[PDB]
Amino acid sequence: RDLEASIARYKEEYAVLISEAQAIKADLAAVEAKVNRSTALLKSLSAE
Amino acid sequence: RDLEASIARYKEEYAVLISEAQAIKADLAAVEAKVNRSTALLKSLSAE
Amino acid sequence: KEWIPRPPEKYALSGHRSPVTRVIFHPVFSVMVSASEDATIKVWDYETGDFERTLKGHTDSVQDISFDHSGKLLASCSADMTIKLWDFQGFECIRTMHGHDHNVSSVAIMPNGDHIVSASRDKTIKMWEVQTGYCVKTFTGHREWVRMVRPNQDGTLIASCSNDQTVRVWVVATKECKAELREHEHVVECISWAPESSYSSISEATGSETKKSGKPGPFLLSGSRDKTIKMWDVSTGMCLMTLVGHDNWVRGVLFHSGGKFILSCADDKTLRVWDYKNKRCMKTLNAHEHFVTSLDFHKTAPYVVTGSVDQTVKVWECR
Amino acid sequence: EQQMHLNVGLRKIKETVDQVEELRRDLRIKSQELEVKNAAANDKLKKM
Numbered sequence: 001r002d003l004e005a006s007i008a009r010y011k012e013e014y015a016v017l018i019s020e021a022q023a024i025k026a027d028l029a030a031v032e033a034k035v036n037r038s039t040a041l042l043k044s045l046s047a048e
Numbered sequence: 049r050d051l052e053a054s055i056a057r058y059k060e061e062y063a064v065l066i067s068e069a070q071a072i073k074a075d076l077a078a079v080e081a082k083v084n085r086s087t088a089l090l091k092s093l094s095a096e
Numbered sequence: 097k098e099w100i101p102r103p104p105e106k107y108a109l110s111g112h113r114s115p116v117t118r119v120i121f122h123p124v125f126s127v128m129v130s131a132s133e134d135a136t137i138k139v140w141d142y143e144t145g146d147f148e149r150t151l152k153g154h155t156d157s158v159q160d161i162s163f164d165h166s167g168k169l170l171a172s173c174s175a176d177m178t179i180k181l182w183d184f185q186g187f188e189c190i191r192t193m194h195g196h197d198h199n200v201s202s203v204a205i206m207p208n209g210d211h212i213v214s215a216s217r218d219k220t221i222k223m224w225e226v227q228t229g230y231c232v233k234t235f236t237g238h239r240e241w242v243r244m245v246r247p248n249q250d251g252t253l254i255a256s257c258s259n260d261q262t263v264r265v266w267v268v269a270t271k272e273c274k275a276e277l278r279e280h281e282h283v284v285e286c287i288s289w290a291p292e293s294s295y296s297s298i299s300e301a302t303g304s305e306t307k308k309s310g311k312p313g314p315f316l317l318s319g320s321r322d323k324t325i326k327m328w329d330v331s332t333g334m335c336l337m338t339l340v341g342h343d344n345w346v347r348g349v350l351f352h353s354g355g356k357f358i359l360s361c362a363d364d365k366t367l368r369v370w371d372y373k374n375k376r377c378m379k380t381l382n383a384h385e386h387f388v389t390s391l392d393f394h395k396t397a398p399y400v401v402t403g404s405v406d407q408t409v410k411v412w413e414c415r
Numbered sequence: 416e417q418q419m420h421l422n423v424g425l426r427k428i429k430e431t432v433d434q435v436e437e438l439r440r441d442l443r444i445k446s447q448e449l450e451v452k453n454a455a456a457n458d459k460l461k462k463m
């Protein structure tokens with residue numbers, strides 16, 4: 001029972017952890033979009 | 049080699065699948081919260 | 097007089113679109129002039145707080161402005177590397193002296209009314225003629241950005257403070273740093289000397305001994321970004337006493353026209369008036385919601401003005 | 416007037432490129448934390 005008990009608690013909580021990882025990489029993707037868009041504008045204003 | 053590879057690949061794919069499940073549950077919660085909020089808005093706007 | 101600013105304001109003039117850098121008073125007219133960071137110098141009537149006009153000659157942000165004794169000319173400096181002279185009768189630029197590389201920070205007309213001093217990032221202080229516009233002599237010895245410069249009451253002695261932690265006093269005729277002071281904890285930003293009516297009040301304030309001539313000698317003051325305001329002797333170069341209590345960076349200091357109190361602004365969002373002779377007055381008065389940049393005390397009228405980064409100029413009565 | 420406005424525009428562009436350099440290091444930090452989180456979750460699943 002003890003190991004099985006951990007098998008659960010010490011796992012579904014770790015699935016919660018990987019959900020937090022999902023949130024982190026979603027934020028990273030949004031930051032990537034900001035990266036490319038800002039760089040495009042900065043390159044556009046080069047001639048000006 | 050055969051069985052250990054099954055292990056690794058499918059276990060990692062199931063981690064991918066628990067990440068998918070966490071994403072779906074987050075979306076469902078967001079949707080449920082929006083449902084409750086809009087229902088409150090409607091029961092507030094009934095008199096109007 | 098015992099003129100003391102009070103917490104209630106009279107007018108909060110907000111015409112500038114950019115933070116205000118310095119404010120001064122016209123010598124004779126009921127006019128106050130405010131320079132800001134938008135290359136525009138605005139002219140107001142402080143008695144009624146009415147916008148009078150604006151001068152938009154400068155290219156980059158205007159840093160420092162100064163009148164002459166007669167109030168007929170207005171010297172201005174900006175980050176556009178140039179010094180403009182304004183005729184105050186018709187309010188148009190009449191002579192734009194160039195040179196003095198990189199951002200010019202301070203400018204002042206010594207009371208003789210024929211020459212101008214200027215200080216800038218190029219670590220030197222240039223002398224210009226009002227009539228002609230030729231830089232006749234250049235003062236070197238500061239190793240860093242010279243921030244603020246002020247002459248004496250008769251056009252012979254000059255003080256230059258800089259980021260280099262040194263305040264240097266220069267002589268018109270000899271072009272030599274007679275007194276060099278390197279004692280401040282962090283960068284010195286603002287300086288102002290003592291009028292006549294205050295020298296006597298210093299003697300019992302510090303206990304200094306008169307020389308053979310008997311004159312206490314000319315005086316300095318320097319406020320430094322280390323939140324310290326130190327008042328100094330020209331003849332000797334030694335500390336008399338130090339003012340401590342400013343929360344944030346000090347930006348502007350000057351003496352009360354009566355030569356009795358000390359009025360100073362700082363980045364602490366507040367204006368502090370402090371006594372020095374017996375350390376009784378320590379009044380702190382919140383002035384602006386944001387950083388406070390500069391201030392000025394009217395020579396005779398019971399009015400003071402403060403310009404801040406909030407693009408707002410405020411007027412306080414004196415009581 | 417023209418020189419004033421051009422100077423302001425140049426200052427805005429310089430501030431823009433400086434903020435672009437800040438965005439890059441923010442993105443680097445985000446990537447690092449995403450990495451640590453995902454690694455932790457994977458090996459906790461490995462534990463279980």
